[PDB]
Design a protein around this ligand. Structure first.
Ligand SMILES: [Mg+2]
Lengths: 395, 439, 362
């Protein structure tokens, strides 16, 4: 056929391009960290805690990683990283032996479809599985040395879903309040703030169904404990203010993009600014006051978009990931700024930066606390990269 | 000197960047205006606050201005066809492609047809009117991409709107042609009801020299560098498969280029795929496990300044492909586990020693069998210390009990025990003890 | 018993060729097809009547420099497509499908140039590869696994040259520069257990690498026959044929005339010679002879461009035969001969990238 020949060609081209980008990096970033895992991951979460040992030049951070192996035993993992915390220090930068190390392994039944730590307790995390339920765990209650037998204490799994999903969000203000979203076209809500009789069985307190398509994502409010929206392939965003008691008719519902919506995120520093992400290769945004206005559109991704995340430490900085093996960085201030024809042929102004590391569909990324401008990225090629852009770009 | 050598060699690197030129021009790898030495680009600064709770009001008013107007049916007659039969007119509706959809969806719905004359002419008329309702709907502003108009008898097509929902069709008498599968045509009305030089070295066996036209634009990627500095940088980094040198001819610039010598460009992936039997390599369709590695490249930059005078990264883990010691085949990441393909007993040795024993003529089978049965067990454990020999003969019969019995050869075993005591390694306190444990 | 030059061709690169192989897997009636490999190219032709030969296909390797050495025609049990594999100095083995005009399999496990490839007469997934690494390997071209490695403490010491299956496919002979000729067996229980195993292995199934078989001992050998190199051997029913640079081909049997072939003790230390064959000007090595699928005639190339032909019939090797078919164009050398499934045509390669053709008139 043709597609085979064509793909061989495309592969060789991508290889060349990565060669070039690597040769060119030194003038581009303030940090380059690459590390290969045995099995890839599908998760990313920076632990909100940081320790910095004295007499040295580096910090220490802990990361929350998942695992989707081929066939063998699945695991939940959290490992260690030694970020340089210094400006004058530079074997490589610090010790010679190692800068990354695994520390936490837990047996897991099925792959990991999602994993987030609870905001109130980082020792509490959730887990989406190939099954139709939810698992919760507290690592401090299990040894890092994994059970050579296999499956172990599910640590209060949940119930109320019928197909798998990917949505996951604790309520920031209210403990125990956690939302879910699966192929069931439904949103299931447990409240584990108080389950003395665990029994590994808790059913979702409330189950919402307003989308008639497979739901894609859900996120709580950032200030309100009784507010959150919804995302399905319906290309319909529905506003779900709880305490109104209707799992059928939400508070609001409009069409966001012409293609199915995938990812969704709210600005922390503001009250109203929403960040939306869809399959439309588009990026839109909205406000809680009025909604019948697609505020703006970022139009440079060349395939679907699967993740959006605002910046901590920065009010006007956002991030767009997808499948194009690229990663974008925008700017809300430079909206329509007259630029030179060469600045324009470079690109539109408001687009701020584009990451050029990975060579596969960028699975997932994350900001972190404890550090101003750094993000880790995970692809499907067993690849983990951490970087810091050069400084000169801003200011 | 078959100059095709000079040709064929420098032929290769060219087309590559050539393709890459176009690709990057549409497939940006990184915004150049971010680059350090391309600092003249990105004329704008990063000086702004731009609170957000006001960004809405600026749009809240702008949308009042942005709403210019809208259009509020149609009717049109077809003047007879002209050529040097009934007609067919359609209303095709196009929607947006979706996730599972590979191509855009199109819906060809007919509003109707009529009976046009058989290629009529002028001065013969004394007439089929086409009237349209609002088939298009405002709800379609989320699902349909566009609407067009089709005409057949023999094909013709027109579209109704613009991407801005802007109608493209005013009212009036229009003359149009059409194609089948000057000439045939139809009329109708409408109604809404420093010179720079180069030198190409070939190991001094020959060369070629040229001159840059429209200089300070990349001779490959047409990148507009405004300085010899930035241009030299972009060249010695991006189009790296060559090598360069700065000559500074008095006329403003001269660069004698040469081919790179090593340019270590080889696949950088799972180093194993290189040898997968073809068709499976680059499968890219299933997770695969491999050994862990970690590199560091950018740790702490210098951030110096420009200096034309100047113009004239470690590992952690296994970074290669290991092989089997005896067959020179690849080594799966799992096979490289505790299996160490080495121990004290090589098969071929056991064979060789027995055979060599059988060369001897002046021996009885009641002796050769014994010697072999023993020497093999000797090899099997590697006994060295003399304090072991007692335990040795013990374990020996402890294993070969059934056999020597089945061999009925214990009597020569005892003769051997004799010999060994004679060589001062057995005490009498065990020789018997053997025959005891034997039964 | 009369062939005539009805055609002769020549390449353009002018670099000597070595290989000639009719496809002896022709469903009865299908046209005659044969191939030939040169410096770094392969060639596909078809025999036509009136001394006509038609170019069909040709491939080439550019990415390195190699001097291809051998070829062999086989098929696919799955869909019956013709199959050709070749190998050169680089020591790699490739497998090409003309139906798709692509290579589907490549094998790299040797350490030097390869010298010959043959298949088991019965099984079509068993490829024997002889190299200069003193090691004769043997692959399952279907499950992509090695099987045996003949050579070691008692192997050949210098650059194995040529080998040949027995007529039935359970016994092999080998010959190399060290004047040495050794016998291997395949019928042993261990061996066939190994083979059956080979036909069963899933890499995804186990964390284990397949386990080959190492053999460190010939069944029998000697170096008493020639006092020079030996570079081509042929099973003869249960008799042997071999040539040297001593300008004579010899036939013999191991042990004594009474000694059966399948009772031979490994420590056998005697051989029985029967007769000799004679020719002129074969004063260089690496020159081969072939025989008809019906084992009735003998062909042999020559240094000065001549030919020499015998009959494998009751013709007593004392005065068996003498037949020299000659032409006046090239006398550079002739490497290799080849017959069809029948005895219709006979091709041979001259040293100057020129082909020849001889059509028989019985
Ligand atoms: Mg391949």
């Amino acid at each position: 056929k043709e597609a085979a020949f064509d793909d061989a060609v495309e592969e060789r081209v991508i290889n060349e391009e990565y060669k070039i980008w690597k040769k060119n990096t030194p003038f581009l970033y303030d940090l380059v960290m690459t590390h290969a895992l045995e099995w890839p991951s599908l998760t990313a979460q920076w632990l909100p805690d940081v320790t910095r040992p004295e007499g040295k030049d580096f910090s220490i951070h802990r990361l929350v990683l998942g695992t989707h192996t081929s066939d063998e035993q699945n695991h939940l993992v959290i490992a260690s990283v030694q970020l340089p915390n210094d400006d004058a220090q530079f074997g490589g930068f610090g010790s010679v032996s190692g800068k990354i190390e695994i520390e936490i392994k837990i047996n897991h039944e099925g792959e990991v479809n999602r994993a987030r730590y609870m905001p109130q307790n980082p020792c509490i995390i959730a887990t989406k599985t190939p099954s139709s339920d939810v698992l919760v765990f507290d690592y401090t209650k299990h040894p890092s040395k994994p059970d050579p037998s296999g499956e172990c204490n599910p640590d209060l799994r949940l119930r109320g879903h019928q197909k798998e999903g990917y949505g996951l969000s604790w309520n920031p203000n209210l403990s125990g309040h956690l939302l879910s979203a699966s192929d069931d076209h439904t949103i299931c809500l447990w409240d584990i703030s108080a389950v003395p009789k665990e029994g590994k069985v808790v059913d979702a307190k409330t189950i919402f169904t307003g989308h008639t398509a497979v739901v894609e994502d859900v996120s709580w409010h950032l200030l309100h404990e009784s507010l959150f929206g919804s995302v399905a392939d319906d290309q319909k965003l529905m506003i779900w203010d709880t305490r109104s008691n209707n799992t059928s008719k939400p508070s609001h519902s409009v069409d966001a993009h012409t293609a199915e919506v995938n990812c969704l995120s709210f600005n922390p520093y503001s009250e109203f600014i929403l960040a939306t992400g869809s399959a439309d290769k588009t990026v839109a945004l909205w406000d809680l006051r009025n909604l019948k206005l697609k505020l703006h559109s970022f139009e440079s991704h060349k395939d679907e978009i699967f993740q959006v995340q605002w910046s901590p430490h920065n009010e006007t900085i956002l991030a767009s990931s997808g499948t194009d093996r690229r990663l974008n960085v925008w700017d809300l201030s430079k909206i329509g700024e007259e630029q030179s024809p060469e600045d324009a042929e470079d690109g539109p102004p408001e687009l701020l930066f584009i990451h050029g590391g990975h060579t596969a569909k960028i699975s997932d990324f994350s900001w972190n606390p404890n550090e101003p401008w750094v993000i880790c990225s995970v692809s499907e090629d067993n690849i983990m990269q951490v970087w810091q852009m050069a400084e000169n770009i801003y200011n | 000197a078959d100059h095709e050598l000079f040709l064929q060699a420098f032929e290769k690197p060219t087309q590559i960047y050539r393709f890459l030129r176009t690709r990057n021009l549409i497939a940006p790898i990184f915004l150049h205006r971010t680059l350090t030495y391309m600092s003249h680009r990105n004329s704008r600064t990063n000086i702004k606050r731009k609170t957000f709770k006001v960004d809405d009001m600026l749009s809240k008013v702008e949308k009042m201005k942005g709403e210019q107007e809208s259009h509020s049916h149609l009717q049109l007659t077809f003047t007879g066809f002209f050529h040097k039969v009934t007609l067919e007119v359609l209303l095709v509706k196009v929607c947006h492609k979706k996730r599972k959809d590979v191509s855009c969806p199109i819906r060809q719905v007919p509003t109707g047809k009529k009976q046009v004359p058989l290629n009529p002419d002028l001065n013969q008329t004394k007439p089929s009117l086409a009237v349209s309702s609002n088939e298009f709907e405002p709800s379609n502003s989320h699902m349909v991409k566009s609407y067009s108009l089709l005409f057949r008898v023999f094909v013709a097509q027109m579209t109704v709107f613009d991407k801005n929902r802007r109608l493209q069709l005013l009212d009036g008498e229009y003359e149009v042609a059409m194609q089948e599968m000057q000439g045939p045509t139809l009329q109708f009305t409408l109604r809404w009801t420093l010179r720079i030089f180069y030198q190409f070295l070939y190991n001094n066996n020959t060369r070629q020299q040229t001159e840059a036209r429209d200089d300070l634009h990349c001779p490959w990627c047409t990148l507009n560098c405004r300085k010899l500095y930035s241009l030299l940088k972009h060249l010695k980094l991006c189009h790296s498969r060559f090598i360069f040198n700065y000559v500074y001819h008095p006329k403003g610039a001269r660069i004698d280029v040469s081919i790179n010598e090593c340019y270590d460009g080889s696949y950088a992936g799972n180093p194993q795929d290189i040898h997968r039997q073809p068709g499976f390599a680059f499968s890219r369709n299933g997770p695969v496990k491999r050994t862990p590695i970690t590199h560091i490249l950018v740790c702490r930059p210098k951030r110096t300044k420009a200096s034309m005078s100047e113009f004239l990264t470690y590992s952690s883990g296994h970074n290669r492909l290991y092989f089997h010691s005896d067959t020179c085949l690849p080594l799966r990441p799992q096979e490289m586990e505790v299996d160490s393909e080495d121990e004290k007993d090589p098969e071929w040795l056991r064979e060789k020693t027995i055979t060599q024993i059988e060369e001897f003529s002046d021996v009885n089978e009641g002796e050769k069998e014994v010697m072999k049965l023993w020497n093999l067990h000797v090899m099997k454990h590697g006994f060295i210390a003399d304090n072991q020999m007692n335990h040795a003969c013990m374990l020996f019969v402890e294993n070969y009990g059934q056999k020597i019995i089945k061999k009925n050869l214990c009597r020569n075993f005892m003769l051997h025990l004799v010999s060994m005591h004679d060589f001062n390694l057995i005490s009498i306190m065990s020789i018997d003890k053997a025959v005891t444990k034997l039964r | 018993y009369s062939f005539k030059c009805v055609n002769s061709l020549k390449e353009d690169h002018n670099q000597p060729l070595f290989g000639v192989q009719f496809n002896w897997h022709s469903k009865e009636g299908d046209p005659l097809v044969f191939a030939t490999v040169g410096s770094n190219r392969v060639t596909l032709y078809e025999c036509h009547s009136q001394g006509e030969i038609r170019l069909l296909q040709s491939y080439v390797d550019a990415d390195a420099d190699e001097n291809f050495y051998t070829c062999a025609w086989t098929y696919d049990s799955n869909t019956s497509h013709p199959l050709l594999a070749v190998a050169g100095s680089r020591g790699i083995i490739r497998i090409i499908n003309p139906i798709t005009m692509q290579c589907i399999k490549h094998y790299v496990g040797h350490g030097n140039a390869i010298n010959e490839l043959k298949f088991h007469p019965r099984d079509p997934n068993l490829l024997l590869s002889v190299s200069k690494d003193h090691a004769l390997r043997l692959w399952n071209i279907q499950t992509d696994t090695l099987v045996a490695i003949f050579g070691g403490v008692e192997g050949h010491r210098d650059e194995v040259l040529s080998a040949d299956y027995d007529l039935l496919g359970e016994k092999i002979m080998s010959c190399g520069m060290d004047h040495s000729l050794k016998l291997w067996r395949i019928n042993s229980k261990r061996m066939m257990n190994a083979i059956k195993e080979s036909y069963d292995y899933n890499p995804n199934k186990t964390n284990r690498p397949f386990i080959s078989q190492k053999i460190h001992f010939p069944d029998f050998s000697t170096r008493d026959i020639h006092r020079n190199y030996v570079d081509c051997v042929r099973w003869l029913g249960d008799l042997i044929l071999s040539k040297s640079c001593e300008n004579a081909i010899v036939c013999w049997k191991p042990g004594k005339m009474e000694d059966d072939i399948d009772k031979i003790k490994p420590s056998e230390s005697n051989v029985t010679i029967l007769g000799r064959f004679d020719y002129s000007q074969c004063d260089i090595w690496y020159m081969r002879f072939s025989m008809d699928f019906w084992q009735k005639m003998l062909a042999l190339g020559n240094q000065v461009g001549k030919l020499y032909v015998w009959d494998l019939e009751v013709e007593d090797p004392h005065k068996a035969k003498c037949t020299t078919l000659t032409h006046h164009k090239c006398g550079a050398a002739i490497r290799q001969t080849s017959f069809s499934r029948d005895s219709s045509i006979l091709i041979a390669v001259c040293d100057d990238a020129s082909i020849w053709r001889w059509d028989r008139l019985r």
